[PDB]
């Protein structure tokens, strides 16, 4: 549904986008396989070509000018970037990144995958918290989100680990919970934290200030 000028212009943008996503996800060029798998578009970036020269290279057929194939490959890189950037504190290992990349690449239609849905759910939880008051509900969501972000960094999002699966269900269920229902808010949080294999599921990943808030919060609810 594009004109000849619109089609090739859109290709030029996506080529630059991949180069920028590559520098953003892997600023140290540690993922050698990932960079090579995009060399055919990266060769047209990381140098001063000028927009007009790449546009002509697209029109002449020198750049990968198949817009649908380029979108497919671009989306896989972007969704991998979201996985990495949606967890700022906790770092993922290079092997997990390449492993999950391959699984995202092999998936028939990543946009409708379970990986995509889980990433959308994670961003929903993190975006709410970025703009929230430190209320009992919001302190519980922060605590559970930090665990979810940690577990994903350790195990990956493509793996159906029971830890992240439970956390997604409970985190979203609490998020949608009415703000005035303090008893249900605590009941859910207490339920989660007590039914874990760890004595202290929040240790280390939460700073002392957040752990002290959680302890005072549960005292202020239950003590009176």
């Amino acid at each position: 549904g594009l004109t000849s000028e619109q089609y090739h212009s859109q290709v030029v943008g996506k080529i630059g986008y991949i180069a920028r996503c590559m520098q953003t996800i892997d600023p140290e060029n540690n993922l050698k396989k990932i960079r090579e798998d995009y060399q055919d578009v990266l060769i047209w970036a990381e140098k001063n070509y000028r927009f007009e020269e790449i546009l002509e290279a697209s029109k002449s057929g020198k750049c990968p000018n198949d817009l649908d194939a380029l979108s497919r490959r671009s989306l896989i890189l972007q969704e991998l970037l979201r996985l990495v950037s949606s967890i700022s504190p906790f770092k993922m290992k290079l092997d997990l990144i390449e492993s999950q990349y391959e699984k995202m690449k092999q998936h028939v239609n990543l946009w409708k995958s379970d990986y995509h849905v889980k990433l959308n759910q994670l961003n929903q939880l993190t975006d709410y918290l970025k703009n929230a008051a430190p209320t009992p509900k919001n302190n519980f969501l922060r605590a559970m989100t930090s665990v979810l972000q940690m577990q994903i960094a350790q195990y990956g999002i493509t793996e159906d680990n029971e830890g992240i699966n439970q956390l997604f269900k409970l985190g979203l269920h609490l998020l949608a919970m009415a703000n005035e229902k303090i008893d249900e808010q605590y009941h859910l949080f207490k339920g989660y934290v007590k039914d874990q294999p760890e004595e202290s599921p929040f240790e280390g990943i939460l700073p002392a200030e957040d752990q002290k808030i959680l302890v005072k919060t549960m005292i202020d609810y239950a003590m009176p």
Binding site: Q6, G13, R20, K112, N131, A176
Partner: protein, 600 residues
């Protein structure tokens, strides 16, 4: 660039000395600079359609020609605002002019230029990088619900030479400057786009996710899909306004647009009164619906040109937000009023009409509007995918689909929710014929239903069979009075009444039926059909034997089962929990199974 008025006839103005004019360029006619556009040209004389009253326009008045067609300003400040049919903010006209009246030739910028917006860049768009149309280079926090994403205008591309840092900027500040072939384009947060031009996308995709609504009769029988195109014939009290409000409040969508074409003065007021007052739950908090809604208000006493343009303005805003990756749901009040505007203008232009006075191209105008919808892959680096759903509304001169507007609509829209006159007279709400209605998204949604529920598709099939069988049995019962019926036929009639009264009928002003979540709709239908199958099996299995089971025996044996089934609508979602409602319906199924086991 300054022509002269040659002759005024109604809202149609003939001008002269406009040799270089192009069709559908905006002009300002008269000393009050009335908004108009060129419809056709003859030599150096232009025929102008005026969007305001032409009283007082003289021969010889100036005509100022501009280089832009009718277009909408798209940028921060849309959400919560009510616009005129040609994009004029009614709340700003009132406050700036301090009068109950709208002045003729009033010029209020569509998006206020005196509001400080919080702009956040993409934080990866370095100077020297390459961008194309549709790219998003920053976000403006209009409110806590909808993030307003600043897109590069379509049909523009180049190298980034300047990007504004994080900060507060007005709608007239330069945010991004890009250079293409030596031409430096300075862009603010507002882009302008012609209303009759379709915003391009990368690919138009099939609609595979449902747009759930609060009415069971609709979702259980004739689903609408995100990116779907439907129409709801007009009928007062039949649910037209309950669907509009429920669709706005509860639906699986991000941005709601409500466009009036020829609304009645007080009905427009009702919408405007409810608009800032209706609320919804978002993430545990109650927020005003206006924050994710932006309507276009146009009453029947407005100029015919604005009555025509209202639809184009609405869909232009809809596509604008579609290109942000949001799911947009656009509700029209009436498309028959749009067709009426086309008939009026076609007459005024003295062009050859077709059936019933309508222009022969009526179908083309409706198709143009209706086909601007669907789930799409958007232009721009982020690879985002949004959708526009369109809900049309054909006011019925009758149930005869020969009506030119009904007929043209039916040939385009995929879902048609026809409202029966006899059900309206009987105060059966929502009033849906459910025999003349259809939805063409069955196969598209079958994947969704089989993935999540697995039970709905076969329940849907059986429910439709029962309703149609009931209509055929009803035709004979009205004649012979049930003197002779098969035992299975008696069950079909009685279960069909259970369905008609306690499943397809609901009072949308009650806490329990203001919105029925789909999981509950499926639960209710599952039990009623399960009853049907067990009641039918019992009488057919014991037929031609000693202990013949009949309906009279079943009703007397387990009368409380029918009461419980008829009570399912009252479980009251949200006040009551999801886990309990599912458990309660599970108990009804277990009780029915034990009731039939003890009967047989």
């Amino acid at each position: 660039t300054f022509g002269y008025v040659h002759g005024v006839s109604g809202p149609v103005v003939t001008a002269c000395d406009m040799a270089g004019a192009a069709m559908y360029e905006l002009v300002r006619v008269g000393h009050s600079e009335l908004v108009g556009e060129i419809i056709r040209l003859e030599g150096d004389m232009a025929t102008i359609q005026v969007y305001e009253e032409t009283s007082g326009v003289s021969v010889g008045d100036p005509v100022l020609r501009t280089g832009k067609p009718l277009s909408v300003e798209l940028g921060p400040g849309i959400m919560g605002a009510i616009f005129d049919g040609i994009q004029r903010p009614l709340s700003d006209i009132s406050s700036q002019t301090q009068s109950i009246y709208i002045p003729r030739g009033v010029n209020v910028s569509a998006l206020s230029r005196d509001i400080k917006w919080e702009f956040i860049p993409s934080k990866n768009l370095r100077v020297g990088s390459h961008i194309t149309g549709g790219d998003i280079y920053g976000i403006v926090n209009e409110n806590s619900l909808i993030k307003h994403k600043i897109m590069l205008p379509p049909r523009s591309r180049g190298s980034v030479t300047y990007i504004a840092p994080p900060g507060n900027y007005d709608a007239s500040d330069v945010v991004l400057e890009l250079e293409f072939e030596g031409v430096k384009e300075k862009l603010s947060m507002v882009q302008v786009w012609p209303v009759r031009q379709v915003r391009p996308v990368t690919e138009k995709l099939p609609a595979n996710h449902p747009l759930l609504t609060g009415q069971r009769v609709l979702d259980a029988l004739f689903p609408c899909v995100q990116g779907g195109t439907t129409a709801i014939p007009g009928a007062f009290g039949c649910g037209k306004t309950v669907i509009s409000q429920s669709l706005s409040k509860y639906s699986n969508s991000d941005v709601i647009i409500y466009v009036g074409c020829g609304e009645r003065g007080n009905e427009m007021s009702e919408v405007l009164r409810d608009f800032p007052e209706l609320t919804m739950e978002v993430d545990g908090k109650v927020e005003s619906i206006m924050k994710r809604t932006a309507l276009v208000a146009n009453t029947s006493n407005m100029p015919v040109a604005a009555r025509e343009a209202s639809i184009y303005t609405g869909i232009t805003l809809s596509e604008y937000f579609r290109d942000m990756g949001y799911h947009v749901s656009m509700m029209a009040d009436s498309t028959s009023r749009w067709a009426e505007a086309l008939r009026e203008i076609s007459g005024r232009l003295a062009e050859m009409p077709a059936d019933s006075g309508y222009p022969a191209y009526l179908g083309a105008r409706l198709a143009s509007f209706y086909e601007r919808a669907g789930r799409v892959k958007c232009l721009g680096n982020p690879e985002r995918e949004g959708s526009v759903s369109i809900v049309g509304a054909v006011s019925p001169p009758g149930g005869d689909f020969s009506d030119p507007v009904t007929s043209a609509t039916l040939g385009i829209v995929q879902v048609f929710w026809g409202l029966d006159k006899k059900l309206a007279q009987r105060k059966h709400f929502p009033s849906v014929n459910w025999l003349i209605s259809y939805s063409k998204y069955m196969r598209a949604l079958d994947e969704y239903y089989d993935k999540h529920f697995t039970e709905f598709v076969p329940l849907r099939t059986k429910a439709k069979e029962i309703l149609q069988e009931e209509e055929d049995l009803a035709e004979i019962v009205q004649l012979v009075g049930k003197a002779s019926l098969a035992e299975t036929d008696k069950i079909t009639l009685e279960v069909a009444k259970l369905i008609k009264d306690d499943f397809l009928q609901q009072n949308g002003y009650t806490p329990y039926d203001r919105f029925c979540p789909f999981y509950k709709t499926v639960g209710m239908l599952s039990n009623m059909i399960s009853f049907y199958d067990m009641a039918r099996r019992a009488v057919e299995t014991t037929a031609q034997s000693d202990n013949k089971i009949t309906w009279s025996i079943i009703r007397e044996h387990m009368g409380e089962i029918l009461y419980k089934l008829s009570s399912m609508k009252f479980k009251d979602p949200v006040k009551d929990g999801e886990a309990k409602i599912k458990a309660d319906y599970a108990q009804l199924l277990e009780d029915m199974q034990n009731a039939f086991r003890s009967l047989e």
